[PDB]
Design an enzyme around this catalytic site. Structure first.
Site, short mmCIF file in Angstrom:
data_model
loop_
_atom_site.label_atom_id
_atom_site.label_comp_id
_atom_site.label_asym_id
_atom_site.label_seq_id
_atom_site.Cartn_x
_atom_site.Cartn_y
_atom_site.Cartn_z
N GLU A 47 0.84 -1.20 0.00
CA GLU A 47 0.00 0.00 0.00
C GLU A 47 0.87 1.24 0.00
OE1 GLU A 47 -2.49 0.01 3.41
OE2 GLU A 47 -2.68 2.28 3.37
N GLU A 51 -1.81 10.86 2.99
CA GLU A 51 -2.87 11.03 4.00
C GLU A 51 -2.77 12.46 4.53
OE1 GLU A 51 -1.66 7.36 6.06
OE2 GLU A 51 -3.77 7.27 6.52
#
Ligand SMILES: [Ca+2]
EC number: 3.2.1.73
Length: 208
Positions: A47, A51
């Site tokens: 991943e 963010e």
């Protein structure tokens, strides 16, 4: 609280991933753009993340997991308040590196233990629980929105262009009717994934 997640139905690999977005601002939440594949689909948990911690939208967090192992968090100061306008965030994912950019400027490079498993492009907005140190506590403020104008993935022989003017079920899916549990303190709702008339994906965080 009900939150929102939008994810591609196909998988994408090495190349340039770009998104034009404007995250939400509030203690206790995160707005993200990331790639993901999990044992949930098997594979091996790989991943790459962009963010935005709502507690302070003047920074952005970069991170990655390779085989279920993360802890590569890098917080960079942006020079502006991300929630105030659209900016372009990208990551160039190649076999031996991940390079992150803000508005075309290189901001972080990683070369250690880089993921290699193709995954889905995903975008979400959610409020946490049990991670007050990371996200600040969530105060129940709502509705909150994270908006995304477009997504683009460029490999050397192909381009995936998604302008986000309408919902396309052959290419994306909305998460709905369940919660990730864990630190995710909200239930995903398809109704929280909307498209504006001007061509933006608008993810919302609302009460219930
Ligand atoms: Ca658009």
């Amino acid at each position: 609280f009900d939150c929102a997640e939008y994810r591609s139905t196909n998988i994408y690999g090495y190349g340039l991933y770009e998104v034009s977005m404007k995250p939400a601002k509030n203690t206790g939440i995160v707005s993200s753009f990331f790639t993901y594949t999990g044992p949930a689909h098997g594979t091996q948990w790989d991943e790459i993340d962009i963010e935005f911690l709502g507690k302070d939208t003047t920074k952005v967090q970069f991170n990655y997991y390779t085989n279920g192992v993360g802890g590569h968090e890098k917080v960079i100061s942006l020079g502006f308040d991300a929630s105030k306008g659209f900016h372009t965030y990208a990551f160039d994912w190649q076999p031996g590196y991940i390079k992150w950019y803000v508005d075309g400027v290189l901001k972080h490079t990683a070369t250690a233990n880089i993921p290699s498993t193709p995954g889905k492009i995903m975008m979400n907005l959610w409020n946490g629980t049990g991670v007050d140190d990371w996200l600040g506590s969530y105060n129940g403020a709502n509705p909150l929105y994270a908006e995304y104008d477009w997504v683009k993935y460029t490999s050397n022989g192909s381009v995936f262009w998604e302008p986000k003017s309408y919902f396309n079920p052959s290419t994306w899916e909305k998460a709905d009717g369940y919660s990730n549990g864990g630190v995710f303190n909200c239930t995903w709702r398809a109704n929280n994934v909307n498209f504006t008339n001007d061509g933006k994906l608008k993810l919302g965080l609302t009460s219930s």
